[PDB]
Amino acid sequence: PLGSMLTLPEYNEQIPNVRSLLTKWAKVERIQDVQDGLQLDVRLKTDTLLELHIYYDHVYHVPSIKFRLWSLDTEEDISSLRLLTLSDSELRSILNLGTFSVTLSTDMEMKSVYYYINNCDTDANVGSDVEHYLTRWISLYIRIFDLNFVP
Amino acid sequence: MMVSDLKFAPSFQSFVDSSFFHELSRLKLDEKALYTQLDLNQFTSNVLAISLRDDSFQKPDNHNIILKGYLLNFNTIELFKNCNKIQFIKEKGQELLQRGLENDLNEIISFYMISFADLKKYKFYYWICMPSFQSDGATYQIISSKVIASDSDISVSFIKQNVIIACVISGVIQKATPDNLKVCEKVVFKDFSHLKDIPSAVTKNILTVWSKLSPRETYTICFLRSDESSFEAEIIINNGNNPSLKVSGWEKNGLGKLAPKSIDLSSL
Numbered sequence: 026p027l028g029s030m031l032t033l034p035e036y037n038e039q040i041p042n043v044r045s046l047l048t049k050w051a052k053v054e055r056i057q058d059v060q061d062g063l064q065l066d067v068r069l070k071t072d073t074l075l076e077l078h079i080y081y082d083h084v085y086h087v088p089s090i091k092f093r094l095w096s097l098d099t100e101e102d103i104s105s106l107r108l109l110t111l112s113d114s115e116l117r118s119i120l121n122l123g124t125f126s127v128t129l130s131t132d133m134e135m136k137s138v139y140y141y142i143n144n145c146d147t148d149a150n151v152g153s154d155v156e157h158y159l160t161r162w163i164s165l166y167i168r169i170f171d172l173n174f175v176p
Numbered sequence: 177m178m179v180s181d182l183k184f185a186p187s188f189q190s191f192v193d194s195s196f197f198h199e200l201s202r203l204k205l206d207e208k209a210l211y212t213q214l215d216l217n218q219f220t221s222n223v224l225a226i227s228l229r230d231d232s233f234q235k236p237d238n239h240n241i242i243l244k245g246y247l248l249n250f251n252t253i254e255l256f257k258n259c260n261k262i263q264f265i266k267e268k269g270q271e272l273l274q275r276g277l278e279n280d281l282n283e284i285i286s287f288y289m290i291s292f293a294d295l296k297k298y299k300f301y302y303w304i305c306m307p308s309f310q311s312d313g314a315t316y317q318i319i320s321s322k323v324i325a326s327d328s329d330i331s332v333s334f335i336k337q338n339v340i341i342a343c344v345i346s347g348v349i350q351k352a353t354p355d356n357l358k359v360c361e362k363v364v365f366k367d368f369s370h371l372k373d374i375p376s377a378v379t380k381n382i383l384t385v386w387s388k389l390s391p392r393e394t395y396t397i398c399f400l401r402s403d404e405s406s407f408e409a410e411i412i413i414n415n416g417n418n419p420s421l422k423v424s425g426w427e428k429n430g431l432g433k434l435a436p437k438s439i440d441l442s443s444l
Binding site: 097098099100102104105106107108109136 | 194198436441
């Protein structure tokens, strides 16, 4: 019964690479190593900051992406950063979802929100090999934010 | 090299997570000390990053370098918008000036957040500053500088410690205590900057203090950096014995302007 064999350990052995090639992505404003993941600050559009989180899901045993968008508005002489909640129609405009799907839900403690790229079929997508699993993944998935990013 | 001007790079860059202004409200409904584990092994835009999550309200140590800053929150956009920062930073400076003169050099580095938590429209206005003081009309210049190496036991020694500032008295580091700061060959600093040959504005604090305590001809400081840009410089403090203290220190918001920053949360 196929299913991801990716172990949280194996996933962590591979995170540094995802971090390395994710640096080549010229849109990246920042990249924090966090526990069991990476948190990037990205400039998706010239007024849209992309707060992107890469973590390891324990249900399905695959790497996952949860993010959330921010708009760089300027009040008066002060710079503002505001959380965006767009319609799935609005969202599908600024991204490249294609066959993929994202659901806007709440965070662990229902304080705020995140857009979740559905990860269920993630495995039937990336492939059999547990070797380079995180590479083949990010390579393909990242495309949802930039068709031109070459990993 | 030739006597050169000594340029300073801004001390930090703030990164306050949205998870911060929630924790605030949770607490505001039941002035506070903020804490943050300084990441010195990786800067952003060549400067230290002051990170403010939600747990920026509790010490996890007695191992890692924690900075203690202070946040005061206002009730209206009025009490906030109408409160001259210069006096605030100034006063905050003098406190720190004093603390360096009578204790240790580490006690001079700190940050301050003035925030207006408006629950009405669920917007948040804040402004952070990290004090940088010098005696009015003071200027610095490098006499000469050498490239420091961290593969040196002497460096490896500062690294192992859990402080950003220290001294060299015979080849062994030691708490930059007013007393130890009078026979110390040089001061060491885990700079909050990676700009080649340009230390952080916070260096002035080390100078202003180290001087007013143990006046010298020159002052050798060693800026240590996770980077390959570590260097030791012979500094000269000209024209500065003035009694009045001038203190700069506010960060510039995303517009480049010296204003606070807004983290709008209307959706939620």
